[PDB]
Amino acid sequence: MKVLILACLVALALARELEELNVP
């Protein structure tokens, strides 16, 4: 009779640090 509602964990991460290209 019962239903278990589980819990779909989503993949959530902080924004990526980037590495820069230099122009002198």
Place this chain on the structure above:
Amino acid sequence: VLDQFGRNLTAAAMEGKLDPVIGREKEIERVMQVLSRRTKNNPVLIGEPGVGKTAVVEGLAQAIVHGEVPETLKDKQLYTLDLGSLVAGSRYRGDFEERLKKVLKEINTRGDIILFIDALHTLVGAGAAEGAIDAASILKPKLARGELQTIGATTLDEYRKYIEKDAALERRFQPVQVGEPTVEHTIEILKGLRDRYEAHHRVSITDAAMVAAATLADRYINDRFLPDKAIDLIDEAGARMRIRRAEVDDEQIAEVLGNWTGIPVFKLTEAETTRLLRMEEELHKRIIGQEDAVKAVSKAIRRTRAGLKDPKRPSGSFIFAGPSGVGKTELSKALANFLFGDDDALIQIDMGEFHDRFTASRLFGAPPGYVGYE
């Protein structure tokens, strides 16, 4: 706060740009009561979308510039803060935190800033998540000390999902209930907003229209809320007057409302009394034959709507007995299209599939933990 993520509502009230805020004065006094506290002087305007939560703050920002503030809120430059625009542009680490610390540094230097954060439920997990550097955890130290005055504005659902659920954020914020206005309160709002929408549209708006805007939006619109829904009727009727041209009336509001729901202006601009006077002849249009049934339910609705009615009874309860499909649910559809102007008001439950009391927990909802909950 810069004029980059928000807007100075105090300077908007200096130049007469904020709309007049009629009523809601128990709430503006309650917001001043929170903002005058020493610690955690942070009200949350809890309401529904369009009940006038921003208008309480617009009314507060008017009360600051008119000197009606209790020498704790005097000369407070109240800024909004679009957290949506503050998150927008964060694709790299530290973008959001930098734009928020610049705002927070600007409030620290000036010391006379009241934040208005519309959609304060966005504050939870604005940067990443609850346990992460988000906008909540950045502001939580200064909100707990009264050093950052912030007026929030959530709905009742969003306050319960995000601020009450977040431990160590429910304390920082003080709930200020902004309820939906009544119809008579909304007419007082519209009469206060009369000079704004008459001057904008260059179209005279009458008292008949503003009573019609507040009454018919409460009846015919039920996904939105009074203050806004009724202002939108006044605003759209004055706009559609400009595409016809000098005067917005009762019938002009019913036209621009009929274009939203699909009710014919007639069924909007009517009068219950006449509205149900030629009820029989309009219910014959899809029921021909079995005429004593139509005249019985037309008499019954005209008894149990017109004149006297207790508010502790439905508009009519009926047992339709007899042979199937001879006009049983055909009359109820014909009554529904008469009801307020929409045929899409008939709901068949089809109780033939039910031969169980356990399926009554699959008709009125399940107990939580069981099937039939959605």
Place this chain on the structure above:
Amino acid sequence: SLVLDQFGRNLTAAAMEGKLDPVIGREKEIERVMQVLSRRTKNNPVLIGEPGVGKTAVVEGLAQAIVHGEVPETLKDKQLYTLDLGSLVAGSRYRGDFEERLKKVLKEINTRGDIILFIDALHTLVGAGAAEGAIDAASILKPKLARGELQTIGATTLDEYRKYIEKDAALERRFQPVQVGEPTVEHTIEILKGLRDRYEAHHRVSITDAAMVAAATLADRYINDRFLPDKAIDLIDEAGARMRIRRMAEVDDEQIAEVLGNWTGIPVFKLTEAETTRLLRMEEELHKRIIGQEDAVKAVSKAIRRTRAGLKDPKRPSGSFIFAGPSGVGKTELSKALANFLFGDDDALIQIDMGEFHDRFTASRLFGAPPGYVGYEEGGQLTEKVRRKPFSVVLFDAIEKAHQEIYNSLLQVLEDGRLTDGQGRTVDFKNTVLIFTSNLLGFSKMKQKVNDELKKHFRPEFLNRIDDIIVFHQLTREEIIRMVDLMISRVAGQLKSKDMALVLTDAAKALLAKRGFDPVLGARPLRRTIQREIEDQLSEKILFEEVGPGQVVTVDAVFTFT
């Protein structure tokens, strides 16, 4: 240092300037975190506690202890910096920025050597500066936290400690959990007595001693979502800020209890002499709504007067009642009358229809699903309706229709005022009025008859916890005559709205009584045969417009209407 100024706030310099609130009390735990900071290895206290209990304040009380020299010699002349992790993430955009700002901060702490670091919201240390390939703030501090070469105070909610710190088990043994408990009432009093200078100066009010005793006593008793220090400070600040708007001033305990009355909705305020007169004449104001039934109207009035006298047990609800009796005699109508007396609204009555709890699997509608299950986060009708309104009248309509295991959920409701929901949040029922309405010979010579039917049906410990079991009279015929006077006044109320009167005769009121009184039900049928045999035949005569304003409708179905 100037690196620590842009990524931190010096609380030691803030305590020199007197910008931190005095921490009066909490000396046993400032002593505790000075022990942890004095350690050789792992000299890092995390202050775990509920939201409000003063976790940030203890560190502010430590910073005031450093500037006063009340610390040991190994803590003297320490500059305590509230490290802003958000400011360190700020200004990073690029790979290695946040790591460089941390190494610059840790270089300054190593160079000066007099820095106590304070990471408020230590749960935000995991995932701080985390990104495309970024060493997070936690992984950089962990070699220094483990060896005692960085003295970092943390402060975390107990919820945020189990969710975020304990999920990084290498970081939870970098820190010593210092329990920052919520204070007692007498400790909260002494906090308020020490914070009275900051709040009398901010609001320019004069906060009396009984106001601060009442702010701590009434907050522990009537506020159950916040924590002792705050909840009581909240009553002091909102009272001083309400008096700030009144002068647009002395803050007594009646100013505190008025603020609590506006905020929890629990009438706790000092009694108005007109409100006491309302409570003393409660029965005859409840007799305006309901006719007869005196041994209940006298008995629910004793419960409310016991609450407003401050004489109820604070560990039990305001009133617990079996409204036992025959059908239709006003079991629900008194519960609505009591809800109108206390709120002015029938819809303030929390009516729990116990008929639809007929099986034993619907009890999660009361208290929510357990974890795992559907409606775990939206769980509990009865718990959430009283978490929002603690002072309520909760009606359990037709209590015998429910399964007998639904009562066992409500046992500690009656005795302890507790109903822990499925989420685990205990909901305060200590201010509710719990009402259980229940529809449930020979040669010789109703209260004895009904009370034995309760002892047969209900559990002996359920009836043991009911404060008053009230058997209801079947309404006599002359009490039906006084009810038809009451039920035409709804019709006559909205007829005087049209300026027309409705005067009945003795034959009309008797004929309604003969058609309304049943041995089966009673009065319920009377409500029907007035709105079907008076109100319907008036409504169509308004439709016919043979009546009008300035008319009287005498009445003698077979009723006459002029």
Place this chain on the structure above:
Amino acid sequence: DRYINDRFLPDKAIDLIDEAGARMRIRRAEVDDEQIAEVLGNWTGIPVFKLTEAETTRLLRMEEELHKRIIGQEDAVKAVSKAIRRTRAGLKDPKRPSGSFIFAGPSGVGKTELSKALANFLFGDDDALIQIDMGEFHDRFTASRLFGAPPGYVGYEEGGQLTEKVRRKPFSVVLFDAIEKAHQEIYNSLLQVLEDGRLTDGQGRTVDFKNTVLIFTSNLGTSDISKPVGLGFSKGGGENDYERMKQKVNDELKKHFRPEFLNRIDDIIVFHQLTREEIIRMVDLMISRVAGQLKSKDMALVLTDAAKALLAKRGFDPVLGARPLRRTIQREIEDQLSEKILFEEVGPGQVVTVDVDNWDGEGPGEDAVFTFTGTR
């Protein structure tokens, strides 16, 4: 190793050495086993420290301190006093909880009440009791409210309502109020709790219950208490009262609980019905709650021995005990004071002497009255 299941041996033990050495740096020094146990006592909350003479005498008169809150119930108060004494003498099994009790007996004789008195003894607070109300666990599927949801479900991050309350306070009194009202599967989750001192939560953290006092109050087996004889023919007609009750409760606990649950309980105490001399003392315990609230408004509630005796006559049910006495004081004292405070017949700054103006000095009382005369 014994009193921590959060951390690991090298550090956990270094933390005790290092913080006791740092606590002595505040004092000045020698770090002995006493100062280690004081650090561990301040950290875990578990009292393992050397008993002072002010507390050694207090544990010896533990029954006398619990009898300030519990009237009668001698074998009940002795049993939980022996549990705390063998815990603080260092004689308990370190693999098992401090005490596992079934408080059984009739309604209103002090089952839930001794659990609050024991938590008030050990902590100074009735609210330090972890009161798990087992009546709302009659559904079989509410066992996850004890340990949490398993992986993949909601309430997996909020894992445990019982496991988390004892992760905070490993030394606590955990009350399982009305254990017979739970499903059979609920106390089967508590079998590891009673014998091994373990309850692994939803996330997989085993919580030490080895320092808890587990109390299972129970109304089970008391339905003949309203009857003086049985249905059958009997040889005797004396006072096997309680006696048959202790037999009937033990029979009905064996029927309702699996024998391995009752095997793991340290003591099943069947409680006495409250006698008449205990209801007389229960009046003083229940007037003092009302008198304590009048002192909040500066009123002294003084009852004479005539009024205290009449409350004991009016409020003596042998079947229930002390809840009809509470309801008697509610109806006869509190409700009449709730009038007279609101009328200003009695008021703040007055002593309210409660007398009886009608009656004999030992009669039953059917026409008697309480008179509330205000003085000062």
Place this chain on the structure above:
Amino acid sequence: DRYINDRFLPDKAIDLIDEAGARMRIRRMAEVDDEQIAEVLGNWTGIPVFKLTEAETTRLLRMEEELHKRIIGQEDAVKAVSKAIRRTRAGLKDPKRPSGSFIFAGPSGVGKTELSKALANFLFGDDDALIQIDMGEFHDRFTASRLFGAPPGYVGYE
């Protein structure tokens, strides 16, 4: 290949050869035989596969007696778990099956859990080395994800 399933044949086997050769170049200040491979595998998986010391062989033959230092009576089950361990240390257990699968049934209190703790202290010196999954906390089907974990895309998958 038998005692590892986290690594892959070429490497894991080279791991045993390289580390046994590296253990022997520590002992010589020299020959790597199969006993030195099994010492390295026993140090690394924790599985005793090495050649049996005569003191340990005596301890395994005197297993029923040394489990009776903690288990009074119950000699049917003390010898049953002793036959399982001796079958493992003789290398006569089925490599596809576990070392022994037992249902200790009977009445309450007679030493079913205590023999499991006595067997764990025999094999490890600590009865807290017993992996004790108390099955009373499994009350409905959905707690099986405590044993093997959450499936992908649910909380506690990691």
Place this chain on the structure above:
Amino acid sequence: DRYINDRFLPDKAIDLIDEAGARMRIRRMAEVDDEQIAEVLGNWTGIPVFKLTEAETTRLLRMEEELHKRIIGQEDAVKAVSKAIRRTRAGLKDPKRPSGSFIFAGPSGVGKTELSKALANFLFGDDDALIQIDMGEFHDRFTASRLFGAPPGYVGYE
């Protein structure tokens, strides 16, 4: 087209032509045939589609006899998995449907898993080449995410 579902027609087929011409030019150091393409597809997908060698043709003739070296009896079941493998290697199964689909049912312990391991030991030389998906740990509604994977964005999708 038939034996790839991860690549696209133009190259997938130029992959077979080019690598067969490359396998052929290692042999002359000159005709790429039908059979030379299927040898390359056999090396690359791992699917035996190539023409059966004489040692392997008679091995499928005696396959029921070779499965009976590892399973005793169960002749109706060894034949029915023999009818299925020999349909596949005769290029003769329906290519819209798996090569064999079987319910092995019956009493516990009579060789249902043993035949599946023997069939995998036939076709691959090792019974750990059996993809053994033990369905008893899938009695939850949502452990189907272990079979097909999490949807994208939910943890463990990758």
